[PDB]
Amino acid sequence: VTPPPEKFNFAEHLLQTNRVRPDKTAFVDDISSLSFAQLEAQTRQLAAALRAIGVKREERVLLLMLDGTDWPVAFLGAIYAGIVPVAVNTLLTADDYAYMLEHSRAQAVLVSGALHPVLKAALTKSDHEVQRVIVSRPAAPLEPGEVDFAEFVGAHAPLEKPAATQADDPAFWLYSSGSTGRPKGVVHTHANPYWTSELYGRNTLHLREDDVCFSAAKLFFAYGLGNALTFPMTVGATTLLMGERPTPDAVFKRWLGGVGGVKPTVFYGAPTGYAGMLAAPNLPSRDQVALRLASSAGEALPAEIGQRFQRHFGLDIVDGIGSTEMLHIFLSNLPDRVRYGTTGWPVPGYQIELRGDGGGPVADGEPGDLYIHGPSSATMYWGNRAKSRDTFQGGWTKSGDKYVRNDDGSYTYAGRTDDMLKVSGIYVSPFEIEATLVQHPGVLEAAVVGVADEHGLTKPKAYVVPRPGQTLSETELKTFIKDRLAPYKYPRSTVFVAELPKTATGKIQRFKLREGVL
């Protein structure tokens, strides 16, 4: 793969790529579609609009939007102007977004109607610098300071040239959270999504122009931003976008061609989603779908889920691992070479090392910490030198995963180095769930650990010591957490116990709970 030139604007790169196919559908969702020509026009008009309200090169804007055709216009429009969109999870709290408005110093926000109320709460409580709120598909009346996205884009002529950025200039941010602390701003450059789109989307998955891509993983996840924006725009594929939660029924409606008159040929999602689908009584039969490739990431794929999907569909599930910091997948099975129970082989372009307790070599078959060297790595966590030094170790990026290398050069997941759980293929801190539980007045102490469900997928499980002399049931505890935590973070079971295993010092020995001591 030839490196991008040193003067490079990633949005201009994607637009120029598709000037050969102006009338092909680029994006379609439940209510709208954009051809590549329509997309380029709206992208450049948004770039002009953001400049006209005074947002400058290198300044951030926050992009808080459900998946839909305005999302790539927002993302590429900022990037075309050399403005840095900070693309964020749409399931967070107002406090989370208040922190991100302050930390990013966002100068504008591009927000979906359905998310405008949470964003208003974040604006009201923070010391932000937002100059304008641009609301895609408002669901309630707007006030001064807020403008409808279509009217904002419609009111400006398209910007005539892109910002003259360098390949290694910041292009956008994603946020990534650890087991404690605030989300970290992962800064990615204009070159980074060129590399993941060429090395993984083109050269590993062999995506092509006549594909119809559809990702259950939203565009704000690094995985979904490549699956359903940077990868298909790189080869001129059409992409289907869906605002709503990806249940088996919502995904099957789209597999069957129920939206936009298109049937997806490439599907991406998490092992939890694949399991939920394979369990659905109305799982489509193979002659009803046009899928030719099924990608998974977000948690290790249990072998039985891959084997059952292959038995049913005649397609393997291609499991790979990436990270927010590496932008997309660096270690993966191949479409024609899948070894279930492993995450396959290094993606060409990336070097993988396993390091032991002193940074040394590990023998094959021994677990080590996984480090990655490749050209799509983020530069830093913005404003956090300490955590940047920990993760970005002279050219190598620490993932926080442990892995074992097999005799055929494949790699098998061996756990985390930092207490995080991957549940429904999304990071969940057990300490967050425990902080929620202990705020219930009937709870004395709580410890949360991951336990495999019946399909082999990790779910949180909570061990709770009730306060003597309050009554407290499992039902009350479920009600309490309902609106306090996202549904993916719900413990799959709660076990009431009289005490928890502790060191001599009073530290909870979480490992003893995982070993089944209670």
Side-chain angles (χ1 to χ4, degrees), residues 12 44 53 96 102 105 115 118 146 204 225 248 251 256 272 278 293 337 394-395 408 420 459 466 494:
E12 173 58 10
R44 290 169 59 192
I53 60 170
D96 294 321
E102 290 173 337
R105 289 202 172 157
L115 306 173
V118 75
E146 296 168 353
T204 299
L225 177 65
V251 167
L256 287 158
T272 294
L278 280 175
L293 168 65
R337 191 185 184 194
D408 67 344
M420 300 287 287
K459 301 305 172 192
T494 301

mmCIF file with all atom_site columns, all heavy atoms in Angstrom, residues 12 44 53 96 102 105 115 118 146 204 225 248 251 256 272 278 293 337 394-395 407-408 420 459 466 494, unseen atoms left out:
data_model
loop_
_atom_site.group_PDB
_atom_site.id
_atom_site.type_symbol
_atom_site.label_atom_id
_atom_site.label_alt_id
_atom_site.label_comp_id
_atom_site.label_asym_id
_atom_site.label_entity_id
_atom_site.label_seq_id
_atom_site.pdbx_PDB_ins_code
_atom_site.Cartn_x
_atom_site.Cartn_y
_atom_site.Cartn_z
_atom_site.occupancy
_atom_site.B_iso_or_equiv
_atom_site.pdbx_formal_charge
_atom_site.auth_seq_id
_atom_site.auth_comp_id
_atom_site.auth_asym_id
_atom_site.auth_atom_id
_atom_site.pdbx_PDB_model_num
ATOM 1   N N   . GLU A 1 12  ? -11.249 15.147  1.487  1.00 0.00 ? 12  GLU A N   1
ATOM 2   C CA  . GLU A 1 12  ? -11.051 15.412  0.041  1.00 0.00 ? 12  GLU A CA  1
ATOM 3   C C   . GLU A 1 12  ? -10.659 14.068  -0.625 1.00 0.00 ? 12  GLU A C   1
ATOM 4   O O   . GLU A 1 12  ? -11.115 13.788  -1.751 1.00 0.00 ? 12  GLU A O   1
ATOM 5   C CB  . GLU A 1 12  ? -9.852  16.386  -0.110 1.00 0.00 ? 12  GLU A CB  1
ATOM 6   C CG  . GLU A 1 12  ? -9.430  16.596  -1.627 1.00 0.00 ? 12  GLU A CG  1
ATOM 7   C CD  . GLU A 1 12  ? -10.530 17.131  -2.535 1.00 0.00 ? 12  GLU A CD  1
ATOM 8   O OE1 . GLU A 1 12  ? -11.674 17.575  -2.144 1.00 0.00 ? 12  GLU A OE1 1
ATOM 9   O OE2 . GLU A 1 12  ? -10.266 17.046  -3.768 1.00 0.00 ? 12  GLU A OE2 1
ATOM 10  N N   . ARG A 1 44  ? -19.430 19.684  1.527  1.00 0.00 ? 44  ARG A N   1
ATOM 11  C CA  . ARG A 1 44  ? -18.734 20.952  1.266  1.00 0.00 ? 44  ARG A CA  1
ATOM 12  C C   . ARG A 1 44  ? -19.537 22.153  1.698  1.00 0.00 ? 44  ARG A C   1
ATOM 13  O O   . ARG A 1 44  ? -18.966 23.153  2.130  1.00 0.00 ? 44  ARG A O   1
ATOM 14  C CB  . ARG A 1 44  ? -18.328 21.011  -0.208 1.00 0.00 ? 44  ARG A CB  1
ATOM 15  C CG  . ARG A 1 44  ? -17.193 19.984  -0.411 1.00 0.00 ? 44  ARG A CG  1
ATOM 16  C CD  . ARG A 1 44  ? -16.892 19.754  -1.889 1.00 0.00 ? 44  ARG A CD  1
ATOM 17  N NE  . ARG A 1 44  ? -16.517 21.043  -2.446 1.00 0.00 ? 44  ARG A NE  1
ATOM 18  C CZ  . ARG A 1 44  ? -16.392 21.331  -3.752 1.00 0.00 ? 44  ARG A CZ  1
ATOM 19  N NH1 . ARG A 1 44  ? -16.676 20.406  -4.675 1.00 0.00 ? 44  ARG A NH1 1
ATOM 20  N NH2 . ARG A 1 44  ? -15.941 22.570  -4.074 1.00 0.00 ? 44  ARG A NH2 1
ATOM 21  N N   . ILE A 1 53  ? -19.745 30.328  10.660 1.00 0.00 ? 53  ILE A N   1
ATOM 22  C CA  . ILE A 1 53  ? -20.014 30.677  12.082 1.00 0.00 ? 53  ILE A CA  1
ATOM 23  C C   . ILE A 1 53  ? -18.737 30.883  12.902 1.00 0.00 ? 53  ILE A C   1
ATOM 24  O O   . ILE A 1 53  ? -18.783 31.014  14.133 1.00 0.00 ? 53  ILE A O   1
ATOM 25  C CB  . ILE A 1 53  ? -21.006 29.709  12.780 1.00 0.00 ? 53  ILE A CB  1
ATOM 26  C CG1 . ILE A 1 53  ? -20.483 28.263  12.774 1.00 0.00 ? 53  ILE A CG1 1
ATOM 27  C CG2 . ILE A 1 53  ? -22.361 29.675  12.063 1.00 0.00 ? 53  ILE A CG2 1
ATOM 28  C CD1 . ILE A 1 53  ? -21.256 27.259  13.639 1.00 0.00 ? 53  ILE A CD1 1
ATOM 29  N N   . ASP A 1 96  ? -21.441 13.012  31.167 1.00 0.00 ? 96  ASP A N   1
ATOM 30  C CA  . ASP A 1 96  ? -20.392 12.558  30.264 1.00 0.00 ? 96  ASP A CA  1
ATOM 31  C C   . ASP A 1 96  ? -20.176 13.567  29.160 1.00 0.00 ? 96  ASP A C   1
ATOM 32  O O   . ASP A 1 96  ? -19.067 13.899  28.866 1.00 0.00 ? 96  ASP A O   1
ATOM 33  C CB  . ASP A 1 96  ? -20.804 11.218  29.658 1.00 0.00 ? 96  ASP A CB  1
ATOM 34  C CG  . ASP A 1 96  ? -20.893 10.090  30.709 1.00 0.00 ? 96  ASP A CG  1
ATOM 35  O OD1 . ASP A 1 96  ? -20.062 9.999   31.635 1.00 0.00 ? 96  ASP A OD1 1
ATOM 36  O OD2 . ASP A 1 96  ? -21.744 9.230   30.539 1.00 0.00 ? 96  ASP A OD2 1
ATOM 37  N N   . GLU A 1 102 ? -16.133 20.252  27.653 1.00 0.00 ? 102 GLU A N   1
ATOM 38  C CA  . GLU A 1 102 ? -15.075 21.074  28.282 1.00 0.00 ? 102 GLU A CA  1
ATOM 39  C C   . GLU A 1 102 ? -13.671 20.633  27.840 1.00 0.00 ? 102 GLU A C   1
ATOM 40  O O   . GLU A 1 102 ? -12.731 21.446  27.591 1.00 0.00 ? 102 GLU A O   1
ATOM 41  C CB  . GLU A 1 102 ? -15.194 20.988  29.799 1.00 0.00 ? 102 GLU A CB  1
ATOM 42  C CG  . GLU A 1 102 ? -16.486 21.735  30.290 1.00 0.00 ? 102 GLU A CG  1
ATOM 43  C CD  . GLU A 1 102 ? -16.692 21.507  31.810 1.00 0.00 ? 102 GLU A CD  1
ATOM 44  O OE1 . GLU A 1 102 ? -16.170 20.486  32.345 1.00 0.00 ? 102 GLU A OE1 1
ATOM 45  O OE2 . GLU A 1 102 ? -17.483 22.255  32.407 1.00 0.00 ? 102 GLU A OE2 1
ATOM 46  N N   . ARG A 1 105 ? -13.001 21.402  24.285 1.00 0.00 ? 105 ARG A N   1
ATOM 47  C CA  . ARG A 1 105 ? -13.256 22.818  23.929 1.00 0.00 ? 105 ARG A CA  1
ATOM 48  C C   . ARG A 1 105 ? -14.032 22.921  22.616 1.00 0.00 ? 105 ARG A C   1
ATOM 49  O O   . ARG A 1 105 ? -13.784 23.842  21.772 1.00 0.00 ? 105 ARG A O   1
ATOM 50  C CB  . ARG A 1 105 ? -11.949 23.624  23.794 1.00 0.00 ? 105 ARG A CB  1
ATOM 51  C CG  . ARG A 1 105 ? -11.365 23.806  25.145 1.00 0.00 ? 105 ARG A CG  1
ATOM 52  C CD  . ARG A 1 105 ? -10.400 25.025  25.224 1.00 0.00 ? 105 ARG A CD  1
ATOM 53  N NE  . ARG A 1 105 ? -10.192 25.008  26.676 1.00 0.00 ? 105 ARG A NE  1
ATOM 54  C CZ  . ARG A 1 105 ? -9.169  25.509  27.360 1.00 0.00 ? 105 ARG A CZ  1
ATOM 55  N NH1 . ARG A 1 105 ? -8.151  26.142  26.749 1.00 0.00 ? 105 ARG A NH1 1
ATOM 56  N NH2 . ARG A 1 105 ? -9.169  25.352  28.686 1.00 0.00 ? 105 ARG A NH2 1
ATOM 57  N N   . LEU A 1 115 ? -31.299 13.305  20.566 1.00 0.00 ? 115 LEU A N   1
ATOM 58  C CA  . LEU A 1 115 ? -30.228 13.530  21.613 1.00 0.00 ? 115 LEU A CA  1
ATOM 59  C C   . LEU A 1 115 ? -30.150 14.978  22.048 1.00 0.00 ? 115 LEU A C   1
ATOM 60  O O   . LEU A 1 115 ? -29.294 15.377  22.831 1.00 0.00 ? 115 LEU A O   1
ATOM 61  C CB  . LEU A 1 115 ? -28.818 13.055  21.038 1.00 0.00 ? 115 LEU A CB  1
ATOM 62  C CG  . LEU A 1 115 ? -28.916 11.606  20.536 1.00 0.00 ? 115 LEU A CG  1
ATOM 63  C CD1 . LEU A 1 115 ? -27.632 11.172  19.816 1.00 0.00 ? 115 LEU A CD1 1
ATOM 64  C CD2 . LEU A 1 115 ? -29.147 10.657  21.701 1.00 0.00 ? 115 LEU A CD2 1
ATOM 65  N N   . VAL A 1 118 ? -30.536 15.538  26.106 1.00 0.00 ? 118 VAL A N   1
ATOM 66  C CA  . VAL A 1 118 ? -29.314 15.217  26.900 1.00 0.00 ? 118 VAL A CA  1
ATOM 67  C C   . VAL A 1 118 ? -28.208 16.245  26.672 1.00 0.00 ? 118 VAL A C   1
ATOM 68  O O   . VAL A 1 118 ? -27.492 16.603  27.606 1.00 0.00 ? 118 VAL A O   1
ATOM 69  C CB  . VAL A 1 118 ? -28.897 13.742  26.745 1.00 0.00 ? 118 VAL A CB  1
ATOM 70  C CG1 . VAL A 1 118 ? -28.202 13.444  25.344 1.00 0.00 ? 118 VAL A CG1 1
ATOM 71  C CG2 . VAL A 1 118 ? -27.859 13.309  27.897 1.00 0.00 ? 118 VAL A CG2 1
ATOM 72  N N   . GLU A 1 146 ? -29.596 27.683  18.086 1.00 0.00 ? 146 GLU A N   1
ATOM 73  C CA  . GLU A 1 146 ? -29.778 26.292  17.630 1.00 0.00 ? 146 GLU A CA  1
ATOM 74  C C   . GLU A 1 146 ? -30.287 26.474  16.223 1.00 0.00 ? 146 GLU A C   1
ATOM 75  O O   . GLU A 1 146 ? -31.080 27.410  15.983 1.00 0.00 ? 146 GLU A O   1
ATOM 76  C CB  . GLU A 1 146 ? -30.859 25.631  18.418 1.00 0.00 ? 146 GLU A CB  1
ATOM 77  C CG  . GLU A 1 146 ? -30.421 25.538  19.897 1.00 0.00 ? 146 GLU A CG  1
ATOM 78  C CD  . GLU A 1 146 ? -31.564 25.139  20.861 1.00 0.00 ? 146 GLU A CD  1
ATOM 79  O OE1 . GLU A 1 146 ? -32.762 25.041  20.497 1.00 0.00 ? 146 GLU A OE1 1
ATOM 80  O OE2 . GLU A 1 146 ? -31.236 24.995  22.087 1.00 0.00 ? 146 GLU A OE2 1
ATOM 81  N N   . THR A 1 204 ? -7.801  -6.830  3.317  1.00 0.00 ? 204 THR A N   1
ATOM 82  C CA  . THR A 1 204 ? -8.065  -8.020  4.125  1.00 0.00 ? 204 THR A CA  1
ATOM 83  C C   . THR A 1 204 ? -9.515  -8.506  3.837  1.00 0.00 ? 204 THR A C   1
ATOM 84  O O   . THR A 1 204 ? -9.723  -9.721  3.534  1.00 0.00 ? 204 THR A O   1
ATOM 85  C CB  . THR A 1 204 ? -7.882  -7.753  5.620  1.00 0.00 ? 204 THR A CB  1
ATOM 86  O OG1 . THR A 1 204 ? -6.511  -7.374  5.799  1.00 0.00 ? 204 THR A OG1 1
ATOM 87  C CG2 . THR A 1 204 ? -8.190  -9.097  6.381  1.00 0.00 ? 204 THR A CG2 1
ATOM 88  N N   . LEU A 1 225 ? -17.154 3.070   12.405 1.00 0.00 ? 225 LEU A N   1
ATOM 89  C CA  . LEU A 1 225 ? -16.699 4.187   11.562 1.00 0.00 ? 225 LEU A CA  1
ATOM 90  C C   . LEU A 1 225 ? -15.931 3.600   10.362 1.00 0.00 ? 225 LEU A C   1
ATOM 91  O O   . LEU A 1 225 ? -15.977 4.150   9.251  1.00 0.00 ? 225 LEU A O   1
ATOM 92  C CB  . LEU A 1 225 ? -15.728 5.081   12.409 1.00 0.00 ? 225 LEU A CB  1
ATOM 93  C CG  . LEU A 1 225 ? -15.108 6.273   11.610 1.00 0.00 ? 225 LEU A CG  1
ATOM 94  C CD1 . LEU A 1 225 ? -16.241 7.242   11.211 1.00 0.00 ? 225 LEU A CD1 1
ATOM 95  C CD2 . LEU A 1 225 ? -14.116 6.945   12.636 1.00 0.00 ? 225 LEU A CD2 1
ATOM 96  N N   . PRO A 1 248 ? -32.292 -8.377  16.811 1.00 0.00 ? 248 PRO A N   1
ATOM 97  C CA  . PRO A 1 248 ? -32.370 -9.302  15.676 1.00 0.00 ? 248 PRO A CA  1
ATOM 98  C C   . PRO A 1 248 ? -33.431 -8.912  14.638 1.00 0.00 ? 248 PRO A C   1
ATOM 99  O O   . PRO A 1 248 ? -33.129 -8.890  13.424 1.00 0.00 ? 248 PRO A O   1
ATOM 100 C CB  . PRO A 1 248 ? -32.659 -10.663 16.345 1.00 0.00 ? 248 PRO A CB  1
ATOM 101 C CG  . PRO A 1 248 ? -32.078 -10.571 17.673 1.00 0.00 ? 248 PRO A CG  1
ATOM 102 C CD  . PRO A 1 248 ? -32.344 -9.087  18.112 1.00 0.00 ? 248 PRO A CD  1
ATOM 103 N N   . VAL A 1 251 ? -32.234 -5.938  12.501 1.00 0.00 ? 251 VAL A N   1
ATOM 104 C CA  . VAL A 1 251 ? -31.190 -6.331  11.552 1.00 0.00 ? 251 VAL A CA  1
ATOM 105 C C   . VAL A 1 251 ? -31.823 -7.222  10.463 1.00 0.00 ? 251 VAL A C   1
ATOM 106 O O   . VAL A 1 251 ? -31.534 -7.097  9.254  1.00 0.00 ? 251 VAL A O   1
ATOM 107 C CB  . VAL A 1 251 ? -30.109 -7.132  12.265 1.00 0.00 ? 251 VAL A CB  1
ATOM 108 C CG1 . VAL A 1 251 ? -29.184 -7.825  11.223 1.00 0.00 ? 251 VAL A CG1 1
ATOM 109 C CG2 . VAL A 1 251 ? -29.311 -6.192  13.189 1.00 0.00 ? 251 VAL A CG2 1
ATOM 110 N N   . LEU A 1 256 ? -33.135 -8.429  4.747  1.00 0.00 ? 256 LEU A N   1
ATOM 111 C CA  . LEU A 1 256 ? -34.173 -8.912  3.764  1.00 0.00 ? 256 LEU A CA  1
ATOM 112 C C   . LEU A 1 256 ? -34.551 -7.847  2.760  1.00 0.00 ? 256 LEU A C   1
ATOM 113 O O   . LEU A 1 256 ? -35.387 -8.044  1.845  1.00 0.00 ? 256 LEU A O   1
ATOM 114 C CB  . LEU A 1 256 ? -35.422 -9.364  4.553  1.00 0.00 ? 256 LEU A CB  1
ATOM 115 C CG  . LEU A 1 256 ? -35.251 -10.689 5.314  1.00 0.00 ? 256 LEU A CG  1
ATOM 116 C CD1 . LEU A 1 256 ? -36.230 -10.911 6.507  1.00 0.00 ? 256 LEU A CD1 1
ATOM 117 C CD2 . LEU A 1 256 ? -35.325 -11.796 4.353  1.00 0.00 ? 256 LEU A CD2 1
ATOM 118 N N   . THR A 1 272 ? -22.164 -11.206 20.632 1.00 0.00 ? 272 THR A N   1
ATOM 119 C CA  . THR A 1 272 ? -23.500 -11.172 21.331 1.00 0.00 ? 272 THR A CA  1
ATOM 120 C C   . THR A 1 272 ? -24.634 -11.041 20.320 1.00 0.00 ? 272 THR A C   1
ATOM 121 O O   . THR A 1 272 ? -25.690 -11.738 20.444 1.00 0.00 ? 272 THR A O   1
ATOM 122 C CB  . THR A 1 272 ? -23.540 -10.059 22.378 1.00 0.00 ? 272 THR A CB  1
ATOM 123 O OG1 . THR A 1 272 ? -22.585 -10.424 23.423 1.00 0.00 ? 272 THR A OG1 1
ATOM 124 C CG2 . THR A 1 272 ? -24.983 -9.959  22.993 1.00 0.00 ? 272 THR A CG2 1
ATOM 125 N N   . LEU A 1 278 ? -28.952 -15.985 16.033 1.00 0.00 ? 278 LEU A N   1
ATOM 126 C CA  . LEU A 1 278 ? -28.994 -17.406 15.798 1.00 0.00 ? 278 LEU A CA  1
ATOM 127 C C   . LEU A 1 278 ? -30.102 -18.000 16.705 1.00 0.00 ? 278 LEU A C   1
ATOM 128 O O   . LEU A 1 278 ? -30.752 -18.996 16.285 1.00 0.00 ? 278 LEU A O   1
ATOM 129 C CB  . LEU A 1 278 ? -27.653 -18.035 16.154 1.00 0.00 ? 278 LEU A CB  1
ATOM 130 C CG  . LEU A 1 278 ? -26.576 -17.874 15.055 1.00 0.00 ? 278 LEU A CG  1
ATOM 131 C CD1 . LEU A 1 278 ? -25.219 -18.419 15.523 1.00 0.00 ? 278 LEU A CD1 1
ATOM 132 C CD2 . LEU A 1 278 ? -27.015 -18.522 13.661 1.00 0.00 ? 278 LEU A CD2 1
ATOM 133 N N   . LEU A 1 293 ? -20.377 -11.815 3.338  1.00 0.00 ? 293 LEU A N   1
ATOM 134 C CA  . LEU A 1 293 ? -19.202 -11.690 4.288  1.00 0.00 ? 293 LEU A CA  1
ATOM 135 C C   . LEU A 1 293 ? -19.785 -11.214 5.618  1.00 0.00 ? 293 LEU A C   1
ATOM 136 O O   . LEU A 1 293 ? -20.668 -10.323 5.639  1.00 0.00 ? 293 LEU A O   1
ATOM 137 C CB  . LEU A 1 293 ? -18.246 -10.564 3.799  1.00 0.00 ? 293 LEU A CB  1
ATOM 138 C CG  . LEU A 1 293 ? -17.167 -10.123 4.806  1.00 0.00 ? 293 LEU A CG  1
ATOM 139 C CD1 . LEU A 1 293 ? -16.207 -11.312 5.047  1.00 0.00 ? 293 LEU A CD1 1
ATOM 140 C CD2 . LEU A 1 293 ? -16.328 -8.893  4.094  1.00 0.00 ? 293 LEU A CD2 1
ATOM 141 N N   . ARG A 1 337 ? -10.001 -17.874 5.495  1.00 0.00 ? 337 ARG A N   1
ATOM 142 C CA  . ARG A 1 337 ? -9.135  -18.639 6.396  1.00 0.00 ? 337 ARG A CA  1
ATOM 143 C C   . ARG A 1 337 ? -9.556  -18.288 7.793  1.00 0.00 ? 337 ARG A C   1
ATOM 144 O O   . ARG A 1 337 ? -9.123  -17.257 8.336  1.00 0.00 ? 337 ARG A O   1
ATOM 145 C CB  . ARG A 1 337 ? -7.635  -18.338 6.208  1.00 0.00 ? 337 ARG A CB  1
ATOM 146 C CG  . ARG A 1 337 ? -6.831  -19.426 7.032  1.00 0.00 ? 337 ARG A CG  1
ATOM 147 C CD  . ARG A 1 337 ? -5.396  -19.080 6.948  1.00 0.00 ? 337 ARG A CD  1
ATOM 148 N NE  . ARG A 1 337 ? -4.626  -20.137 7.626  1.00 0.00 ? 337 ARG A NE  1
ATOM 149 C CZ  . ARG A 1 337 ? -3.342  -19.950 7.937  1.00 0.00 ? 337 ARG A CZ  1
ATOM 150 N NH1 . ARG A 1 337 ? -2.740  -18.781 7.650  1.00 0.00 ? 337 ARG A NH1 1
ATOM 151 N NH2 . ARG A 1 337 ? -2.694  -20.882 8.560  1.00 0.00 ? 337 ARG A NH2 1
ATOM 152 N N   . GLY A 1 394 ? 6.795   4.528   22.486 1.00 0.00 ? 394 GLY A N   1
ATOM 153 C CA  . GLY A 1 394 ? 7.701   4.643   21.321 1.00 0.00 ? 394 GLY A CA  1
ATOM 154 C C   . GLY A 1 394 ? 7.377   3.876   20.048 1.00 0.00 ? 394 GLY A C   1
ATOM 155 O O   . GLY A 1 394 ? 8.234   3.143   19.537 1.00 0.00 ? 394 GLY A O   1
ATOM 156 N N   . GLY A 1 395 ? 6.195   4.080   19.464 1.00 0.00 ? 395 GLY A N   1
ATOM 157 C CA  . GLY A 1 395 ? 5.897   3.391   18.197 1.00 0.00 ? 395 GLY A CA  1
ATOM 158 C C   . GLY A 1 395 ? 5.001   2.170   18.412 1.00 0.00 ? 395 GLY A C   1
ATOM 159 O O   . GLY A 1 395 ? 4.301   1.694   17.469 1.00 0.00 ? 395 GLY A O   1
ATOM 160 N N   . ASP A 1 407 ? 0.982   -22.517 17.532 1.00 0.00 ? 407 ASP A N   1
ATOM 161 C CA  . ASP A 1 407 ? 1.966   -23.099 16.569 1.00 0.00 ? 407 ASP A CA  1
ATOM 162 C C   . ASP A 1 407 ? 1.720   -22.797 15.089 1.00 0.00 ? 407 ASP A C   1
ATOM 163 O O   . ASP A 1 407 ? 2.610   -22.914 14.230 1.00 0.00 ? 407 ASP A O   1
ATOM 164 C CB  . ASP A 1 407 ? 2.030   -24.637 16.760 1.00 0.00 ? 407 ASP A CB  1
ATOM 165 N N   . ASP A 1 408 ? 0.510   -22.406 14.736 1.00 0.00 ? 408 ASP A N   1
ATOM 166 C CA  . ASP A 1 408 ? 0.305   -21.993 13.342 1.00 0.00 ? 408 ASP A CA  1
ATOM 167 C C   . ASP A 1 408 ? 0.336   -20.448 13.143 1.00 0.00 ? 408 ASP A C   1
ATOM 168 O O   . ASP A 1 408 ? -0.014  -19.919 12.062 1.00 0.00 ? 408 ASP A O   1
ATOM 169 C CB  . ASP A 1 408 ? -1.013  -22.584 12.876 1.00 0.00 ? 408 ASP A CB  1
ATOM 170 C CG  . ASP A 1 408 ? -2.209  -21.967 13.619 1.00 0.00 ? 408 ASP A CG  1
ATOM 171 O OD1 . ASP A 1 408 ? -1.975  -21.310 14.699 1.00 0.00 ? 408 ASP A OD1 1
ATOM 172 O OD2 . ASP A 1 408 ? -3.365  -22.173 13.182 1.00 0.00 ? 408 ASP A OD2 1
ATOM 173 N N   . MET A 1 420 ? -11.284 -4.492  32.839 1.00 0.00 ? 420 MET A N   1
ATOM 174 C CA  . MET A 1 420 ? -12.477 -4.169  32.010 1.00 0.00 ? 420 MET A CA  1
ATOM 175 C C   . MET A 1 420 ? -13.122 -5.448  31.556 1.00 0.00 ? 420 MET A C   1
ATOM 176 O O   . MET A 1 420 ? -12.445 -6.526  31.391 1.00 0.00 ? 420 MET A O   1
ATOM 177 C CB  . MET A 1 420 ? -12.106 -3.377  30.778 1.00 0.00 ? 420 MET A CB  1
ATOM 178 C CG  . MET A 1 420 ? -11.455 -2.073  31.071 1.00 0.00 ? 420 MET A CG  1
ATOM 179 S SD  . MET A 1 420 ? -12.667 -0.916  31.701 1.00 0.00 ? 420 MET A SD  1
ATOM 180 C CE  . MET A 1 420 ? -13.647 -0.448  30.338 1.00 0.00 ? 420 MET A CE  1
ATOM 181 N N   . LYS A 1 459 ? -20.621 -11.656 30.739 1.00 0.00 ? 459 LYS A N   1
ATOM 182 C CA  . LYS A 1 459 ? -21.623 -10.733 31.199 1.00 0.00 ? 459 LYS A CA  1
ATOM 183 C C   . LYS A 1 459 ? -21.198 -10.394 32.648 1.00 0.00 ? 459 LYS A C   1
ATOM 184 O O   . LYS A 1 459 ? -20.535 -11.205 33.283 1.00 0.00 ? 459 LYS A O   1
ATOM 185 C CB  . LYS A 1 459 ? -23.000 -11.440 31.266 1.00 0.00 ? 459 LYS A CB  1
ATOM 186 C CG  . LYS A 1 459 ? -23.547 -12.052 29.970 1.00 0.00 ? 459 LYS A CG  1
ATOM 187 C CD  . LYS A 1 459 ? -23.616 -11.035 28.825 1.00 0.00 ? 459 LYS A CD  1
ATOM 188 C CE  . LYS A 1 459 ? -23.997 -11.856 27.521 1.00 0.00 ? 459 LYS A CE  1
ATOM 189 N NZ  . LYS A 1 459 ? -23.834 -11.068 26.277 1.00 0.00 ? 459 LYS A NZ  1
ATOM 190 N N   . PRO A 1 466 ? -26.058 -7.581  51.550 1.00 0.00 ? 466 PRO A N   1
ATOM 191 C CA  . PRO A 1 466 ? -27.098 -6.610  51.933 1.00 0.00 ? 466 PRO A CA  1
ATOM 192 C C   . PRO A 1 466 ? -26.794 -5.973  53.297 1.00 0.00 ? 466 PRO A C   1
ATOM 193 O O   . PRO A 1 466 ? -26.067 -6.587  54.087 1.00 0.00 ? 466 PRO A O   1
ATOM 194 C CB  . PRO A 1 466 ? -28.406 -7.417  51.920 1.00 0.00 ? 466 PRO A CB  1
ATOM 195 C CG  . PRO A 1 466 ? -28.070 -8.832  51.591 1.00 0.00 ? 466 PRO A CG  1
ATOM 196 C CD  . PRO A 1 466 ? -26.511 -8.981  51.600 1.00 0.00 ? 466 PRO A CD  1
ATOM 197 N N   . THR A 1 494 ? -27.431 -11.460 40.033 1.00 0.00 ? 494 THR A N   1
ATOM 198 C CA  . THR A 1 494 ? -27.019 -10.917 41.321 1.00 0.00 ? 494 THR A CA  1
ATOM 199 C C   . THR A 1 494 ? -27.123 -12.017 42.341 1.00 0.00 ? 494 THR A C   1
ATOM 200 O O   . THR A 1 494 ? -28.112 -12.780 42.378 1.00 0.00 ? 494 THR A O   1
ATOM 201 C CB  . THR A 1 494 ? -27.878 -9.689  41.631 1.00 0.00 ? 494 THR A CB  1
ATOM 202 O OG1 . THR A 1 494 ? -27.661 -8.776  40.569 1.00 0.00 ? 494 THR A OG1 1
ATOM 203 C CG2 . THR A 1 494 ? -27.421 -9.049  42.875 1.00 0.00 ? 494 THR A CG2 1
#
